[PDB]
Subunit: 208 residues, 5 copies
């Protein structure tokens, strides 16, 4: 039995990854759903106005080219796969000051309806003035995330909720979270006439 289930998977993957995705286009656009789970505000540097966050970001999208019929494949309904084997969106912070450091395995889950889920954990340094962190109202900082190169005509972004998930926030962090929201926005950049979509992460925090 088990030998055939392994074989059914190896076959599914072979069939998918070796019979045919060039990325989204204006004719074939994509919606990426984004959500943030903030784990820690590690460091706030008032000498450079950089703050370091640890969080994970749930990403979801769906491709017709990743679809299969589970009956054709021993009732496999989903699988884990290296993120290198598939297209992934180029979700980038707009005001980082250091390259993101990746903290989790680059492996995604693909489902038979063609939907993909990928949940990278990251440490990010970004532009933030923490003046006021030692006050009751705390400091407020914001960072936009979205595709670096795909306009709103190729990649649209959505959230499931405007509330950042704080259920895993580190109970003994140096900083407590007063509020954290994630909200879709439209931008234009100087290069191009097309609008570009971002999700803006806004965090209000203070010294515990």
């Amino acid at each position: 039995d088990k030998l055939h289930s392994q074989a059914n998977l190896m076959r599914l993957k072979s069939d998918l990854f070796n019979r045919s995705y060039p990325g989204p286009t204006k004719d074939d656009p994509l919606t990426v759903t984004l959500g943030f789970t903030l784990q820690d505000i590690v460091k706030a540097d008032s000498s450079t106005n950089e703050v370091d966050l640890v969080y994970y970001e749930q990403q979801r999208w769906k491709l017709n080219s990743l679809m299969w019929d589970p009956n054709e494949y021993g009732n496999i309904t989903d699988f884990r796969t290296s993120a290198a084997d598939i297209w992934t969106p180029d979700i980038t912070a707009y005001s980082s000051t250091r390259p993101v450091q990746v903290l989790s395995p680059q492996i995604a889950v693909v489902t038979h309806d063609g939907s993909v889920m990928f949940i990278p954990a990251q440490r990010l340094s970004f532009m933030c003035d923490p003046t006021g962190v030692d006050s009751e109202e705390g400091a407020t900082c914001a960072v936009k995330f979205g595709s670096w190169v795909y306009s709103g005509f190729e990649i649209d972004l959505k959230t499931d909720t405007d509330q950042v998930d704080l259920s895993s926030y580190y109970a003994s962090s140096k900083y407590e979270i007063l509020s954290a929201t994630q909200t879709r926005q439209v931008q234009h950049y100087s290069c191009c006439p097309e609008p570009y979509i971002d999700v803006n992460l806004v965090v209000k925090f203070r010294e515990r």
Copy 2:
């Protein structure tokens, strides 16, 4: 000696070329045994609440596809191989604050019964408030380790003991270990209804007197 080399090369070729591992599935789940050997608490940063640990993580699992009959291969009963040649579990700390730094060669040992042993040494920074480390009672912190992407239906975990191996702990570390335990736990994450399995490392420590 010529024959023995040829026998090993043949085995590896048979296993890695002439045979078809896409990872565990709900239909073919895997149990990984995990244990920790703590070598050093290097740094405890009270300004960011990060602690740095150096440890070895013993991983063991068994695959039917790695099995062979030693009698067919000159009585070879195990071999060393690059961790790149085989599947390995995506064991991840839940509350790291920086990418782990790998401190040992990425080489595993495969045995004829299909079992694999792999023992990466690593430096880890993780979320830990060291308040109390300057007192008799010390500081206590914890970090969970488990598959990032495979639920308990695909990867289960277990330990061989509740006690973290402290027999190699650095005798002149800045910190001494009061207790160190490792315990299987079940978690649920927002994305998904399935349970995810971890081994929780709980360490009580204080400044050396």
Copy 3:
């Protein structure tokens, strides 16, 4: 059906362009790279080593005949996104960096049917800069040149659209405020070689926020 066809068309175009045939510019086939800087933040100024750290992105544009197509032969595809590894890109280098530049954006470019390419890397750069005076009304002045490391002005020319650095995305709560920032084309000569080399010199006047 339509979405299946558009994908097939793009895959086919990319196949035709990249699988079925550019060794860089030469004196017989030279190239112009238009450069523009958008300065986001002066992160740090270290007076103990005379290094300043900047975050910016750099818009780069050029055009190749080899990247041309008729949208009509490809379902009216007029442009596409592509990994920067799939195409030639110019070796634009800061002359007085003190650390390898850190890349902050995905290495992906946009290619248009007229053969034009746009690539906009975001970078954190440490460069040689004496911040003396930063604590004064007048501020400090530093400069860093950007150009091809290996291609002379006979192979790669540089152009700017304006001599003004784009400050519309400068971080409003940076430790440093920008008094002015200019980008100016220049010609240099190096010891190795008789040929002139082109650079764009970024000059930044800044002070501690007041």
Copy 4:
């Protein structure tokens, strides 16, 4: 002539280009350390940083040739990626080692290989006493991570660390530095384990 020698070498390398040692086909690796500098001693974390190079030597039958079949080529330089190399590891490092020299080895026609990696290492070391006449003492063991003494034996030519290239203006002076082969057994396993223990006594210059 020069084109003939190029082709002779190209041919030798192609003709030559081993799954590692085993209980049945064990290997002895000779090790020797040359200490260049104690760069840093951090009393806040008990870490010390060393710069040194390590001479590694071993011999493989699979790497032998007759020079007369190859234009009297007696040795060649080769990328360490092209050959098997021993997984010699510090056992109490606190950072990944940093490689300071090209990963190229020399192979000789008798199948012997020489490889001399220079490295910066941070390792577990309490420097208490460095500011006194007696100085500080620290130790770090080096050995295979994955092979037991039944697969890889270690040999040294000397128990003296080579100090002839020690930086004369280092922040730290070396009082002594030894490298001692140790054989031991652990609770887990019947087979012997072999390491070379580097012991360094040093003090502020």
Copy 5:
């Protein structure tokens, strides 16, 4: 005309690299001489707590291989070309007393000329063993660092300089440190492993606080 020039270049590069097995490096029977020369841009940092100094410089390297020769007449009168350093053999020039891996600051691209000669000019940031005691005095501090092939003896790789004077023409004028002198000198070394002599170029820099 331009399309022919590109075709000529890709043909030449295919004839040299694609239809020839990579040069196996120098040997006693086919030895090589590498010319080296340094251009010092900045002494960035001098750490008296560890006795490490950090230098930013570029290093011009030149060598010549018969296997890289062509007749420009067979190739549209192409007399030289830029190429990725990964396409060709390059010397393993290493500092003997570095304390961290070198950081590369320029694109790893070289120029190959039709006589088989190669020019490659890497910019690097190097930390090396140096006691800066006396940098705050009029006489300054003196440090030295040797460079050469880590693995090839003088029977395989010899070195030479064009001058014993380090090029100071691009030294950062507002560095924390001023250069009093900087020389580069060929030496013959013997290492413990081996009877053969090894060649280095010793860089000696005298410097003091600005």
